[PDB]
Design a protein around this ligand. Structure first.
Ligand SMILES: O=C(O)[C@@](O)(COP(=O)(O)O)[C@H](O)[C@H](O)COP(=O)(O)O
Ligand SMILES: O=C(O)[C@@](O)(COP(=O)(O)O)[C@H](O)[C@H](O)COP(=O)(O)O
Ligand SMILES: [Mg+2]
Ligand SMILES: [Mg+2]
Lengths: 139, 482, 139, 482
């Protein structure tokens, strides 16, 4: 299965050059970029691993791209996204987030059903990758 | 002779009898507005022979302290202070029998945190007055101080996206169809299919509450199965707007509590529930970690005509104050009334931290939103992915694009329908961000026909629907063009 | 007993000269005077009977005194008080009330005790004048 | 070569390290104050060698967004918006190394309706800072927009006087004495006798709660018998402030509800219960038709000295916002600290609808009170009927004058004590309203001697106490004269 988190995931995996253009857009709008990694694809995994600090000062897309590829080369098999962050008043949040990397063999999830009161069901979404192996050796 | 007679009030103002509302101190051409005043702009069509200032003062007075004849009881109060002031009257562009009337109300007139009380004064009686042939509340300046007594959105645009883990593209939805008749089982089917195919949300129709054909608990349980199945299949947070609209407030809560208990991220209410239930369920939604989607059912009974009613832009303000997280605000290009200029202003009111005067967008007053949270506009009704370039340009980033028929109508099934819409969307956004002139009549359709070459469901949706448009004249237009 | 409602009822009954001086003070402050009558002396009898309207457009203490004296002639045996209303933002209420007339002889009250839960008593204050005779013929 | 080092922030402002708070953005001498800002005025005594402005910046920083070293996380927020700006540092008159520092705080820093939160920022940590040897909060401008989130007094002066049916003079009361030791039955005796003799109210002493010598229920029942006996004997509404101060919020409400059920017009609470217990009970008092009397226990632990703590005028602002009906605010001539100018400031703060700058009275900010009801000040502690002229002058009309020992220490009995106080009072006000120059050291004592020729009880209390004064230098004194 294809993990469809991120905002460009019904399109094909983005090229370096297509990512640079999205970075350019975000930098021209004043936003701060950062890169993050995980091998827990659970939809409620809010906190992927920071790759360094967000790049607030930077005036050139190539810097984000250079950091992306350094992260690519150091991190284990998994997922990397780039986020754009807007410190503006009345936003103060992520305004863009898309997957830059995804492992070849994502098995995905199964739905785990526990009986609640009456007909109610207690759902837990369970990842095959995560239950079989620890962080760093899941893909 | 008798005591009643010796103690009669003999002053010009409080002697008994009818004097005009303008001579009762409800008119002042040089009142200076305070930052704590509630301001209201009215569009007043006075009756033949009624003075334009008189009708403006009449409206001021009967919405604050006045009545038709003079009362000595004014003098038990600080009556200078409580009287509203009609303080400006311009004629409406291109008409000499319709007037814009600005009226200022003192802060203390209004119960804190009560839209019921705000509206009781402002729309209570005055629209049915004889001296006025028509009357429309066009805009209001809700002052910071009154706004701080309200919750504003329960969740709001920013936190909603965080709970969803979805940033960068407009969000996506579909109303389940047919409107009525589906069993809870089949509802859960449609929700699973649509969500699995790419939609962030589905929703109950406004009129799906609990009926012989499908009782509400069945729908909720079956949709939850569908929702969690979708999220298990995609690794996305998913949901469906479970409708909690009901006859009584006890039933609404019961349904809200049921939604919460089985894990729903979102619930919907209809506007016909009314302002007091809305405020209740908006506090409830904050306290129980729930998204609150307002369907604006009934709005266009008062909102449609230009000569009379309430402009939807004021409903925007009131609903953002009460605290709903979503509200439908029009599409421009779909089946429901929407002039691009007015819709844009609606969207600004819902989304911005403050408003600057912009008469083309129908924004008559400047206004701070007092860090009340931002309300998510919803674009719904007879739209399809062949229009995606128009949707993005007109409606911007923070919005939920709903495609009930434009998903379910898809000849290759519901999953095909949803996928067509999301590819459409993502490619269009991708393109905008790259610098492409997506709104151009040539480029926009081409970005989608190019996207269709690698998406089968999209080609089909473009083939089926690309002629379809709802090219009709507006009723709610601006009085200032762009 | 002496009914000790009003703000000068621990002093001797006010003369007309003393009353006028208090009226004159109230009216120099811009306050609206009124005259009121009752023969129900109960503490919680908020609403005495109005002797006409409050005298809003009246600049002359002597006119107020005249209405006091006319109330005194026309009203059945009882109590008369004069109040001064202040209509200003921040007040919007009475700011001076005192008794101008009182009956020759006021039997007063008794405290009626009804057993409530536990040791709680439910209390009612009963006027002797009121229980014995209707309004207009209590003194 | 490591990712940490390459993405290390290298800007002047967000690089790691200590920098002066005056460079962190917390000192801006040309900040334009907004109407929605919360303002504080602090009196700062910096340590030898610390720049005054840097101290003001430290206070502004450490009560808003700052810590001692620079943090990159500021950049996840709208940091520039949330910092408080010290906007004015001025020398204090006649102290050479002490300063007034005005600091502006953005409205959104503060939880709506929460005194706990306001104090958490404004007084939380900045007084224990080593770089400052002393710190005192002298005044605050609480903005209109923040004030509307608060209830204000449950009752307020106006509705309080309507419940008592008492207008035209100061109200009158007394603390029951001895402070500790009396049984329930005897408490009711004392209360009965004082109310019968003329007092509007008596009160439990602040440290009378529930104890081995008297458990609270016994006092409550017996006090109501005495109160209702006095009301029946006099034809007035009567009450006693039953103290509901207790260890836990559960017990305070139990005492409050007991007081309600038995028909008490009024309850009291001690400040030592703390702000959150206080806001709860102020809300309760609104909902349950109860007058709420605040005894200010512990206030002088921080309010007494000029160099350090919180001036009582600020406490006045805070308790009026929280919504107590009475607060003890000083006597000037009695046994407890109270400089004439400072007291009149406090009394103005609690009673006026707004405040103009009045530096001799210690009113450093102008401030609208946002139609929050007016709080009745209470003058209590070591006063007697022989000083009534001074009390009427310094304190005005809307006040409760309290004579505990000045009633119960009367040799002819508690009734006599009460009657003497009430005649002095009524006879003094009667004479003020007549035009008499009552405050003159001649004429005041003469108005009382006249009334004493026709009131045995008052004659006796003048002879007992006439030479009694508490003439000591004040600690809590003004910086500006007139
Ligand atoms: O009931 C309907 O018609 C819809 O379900 C649209 O369905 P389709 O998407 O299948 O057309 C929506 O409720 C309306 O668009 C609401 O109007 P508005 O958005 O103006 O409030
Ligand atoms: O405990 C006491 O001493 C009192 O009962 C006074 O009794 P007397 O009239 O018998 O002295 C009061 O609580 C003090 O006035 C409190 O001080 P403040 O009002 O300044 O907080
Ligand atoms: Mg519908
Ligand atoms: Mg005490």
């Amino acid at each position: 299965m294809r993990l469809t988190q991120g905002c460009f995931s019904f399109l094909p995996d983005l090229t370096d050059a297509q990512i640079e253009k999205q970075v350019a857009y975000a930098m021209a709008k004043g936003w701060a970029m950062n890169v993050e990694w995980t091998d827990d694809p659970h939809p409620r995994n809010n906190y992927w691993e920071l790759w360094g600090l967000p790049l607030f000062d930077i005036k050139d897309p190539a810097t984000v791209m250079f950091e992306l590829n350094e992260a690519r080369k150091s991190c284990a098999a998994g997922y990397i996204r780039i986020n754009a962050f807007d410190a503006s008043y009345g936003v103060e949040s992520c305004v863009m987030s898309f997957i830059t990397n995804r492992p070849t063999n994502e098995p995905g999830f199964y739905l785990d059903r526990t009986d609640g009161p009456g007909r109610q069901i207690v759902y837990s979404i369970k990842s095959y990758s995560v239950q079989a192996n620890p962080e760093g050796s899941r893909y | 002779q008798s005591v009643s007679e010796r103690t009669r009030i003999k002053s010009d103002r409080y002697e008994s009898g009818v004097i005009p509302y303008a001579k009762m101190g409800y008119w002042d051409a040089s009142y200076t507005v305070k930052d704590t005043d509630v301001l209201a702009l009215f569009r007043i069509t006075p009756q033949p022979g009624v003075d334009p200032v008189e009708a403006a003062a009449a409206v001021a007075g009967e919405s604050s302290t006045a009545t038709w004849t003079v009362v000595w009881t004014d003098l038990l109060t600080a009556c200078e202070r409580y009287r509203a002031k009609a303080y400006r009257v311009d004629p409406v562009p291109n008409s000499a029998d319709v007037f814009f009337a600005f009226i200022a109300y003192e802060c203390d007139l209004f119960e804190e945190a009560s839209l019921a009380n705000l509206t009781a004064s402002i729309i209570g009686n005055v629209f049915g007055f004889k001296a006025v042939s028509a009357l429309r509340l066009e805009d209001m300046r809700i002052p910071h101080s009154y706004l701080x007594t309200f919750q504003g959105p329960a969740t709001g645009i920013i936190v909603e996206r965080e709970r969803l883990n979805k940033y960068g593209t407009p969000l996506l939805g579909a109303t389940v169809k047919p409107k009525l008749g589906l069993s809870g089982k089949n509802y859960g089917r449609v929700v699973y299919e649509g969500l699995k195919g790419g939609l962030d949300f589905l929703k109950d129709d406004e009129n799906i509450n609990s009926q012989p054909f499908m009782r509400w608990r069945e729908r909720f349980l079956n949709c939850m199965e569908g929702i969690n199945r979708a999220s298990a299949a995609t690794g996305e947070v998913k949901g469906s707007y479970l409708n909690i609209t009901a006859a009584t407030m006890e039933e609404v809560y019961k349904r809200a509590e049921y939604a919460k208990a089985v894990g729903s991220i979102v619930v919907m209410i209809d506007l016909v529930m009314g302002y007091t239930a809305i405020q209740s369920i908006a506090y409830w939604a904050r306290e129980n970690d729930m998204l609150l989607h307002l369907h604006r059912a009934g709005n266009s009974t008062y909102a449609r005509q230009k000569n009379h009613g309430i402009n939807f832009r004021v409903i925007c303000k009131w609903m953002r104050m009460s605290g709903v997280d979503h509200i439908h605000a029009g599409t421009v290009v779909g089946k429901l009334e929407g002039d691009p200029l007015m819709i844009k202003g609606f969207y600004d009111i819902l989304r911005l931290t403050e408003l600057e005067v912009n008469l083309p967008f129908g924004i008559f007053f400047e206004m701070d939103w007092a860090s009340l949270r931002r309300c998510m506009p919803v674009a719904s009704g007879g739209i399809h992915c062949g229009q995606m370039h128009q949707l993005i340009h007109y409606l911007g980033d923070d919005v939920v694009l709903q495609f009930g028929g434009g998903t379910i109508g898809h000849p290759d099934g519901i999953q095909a329908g949803a996928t067509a819409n999301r590819v459409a969307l993502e490619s269009m956004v991708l393109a905008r961000n790259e610098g492409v002139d997506y709104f151009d009549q040539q480029v926009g359709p081409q970005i989608l026909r190019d996207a269709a070459k690698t998406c089968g469901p999209l080609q089909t949706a473009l083939d089926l629907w690309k002629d379809i448009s709802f090219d009709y004249t507006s009723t709610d237009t601006a009085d200032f063009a762009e």
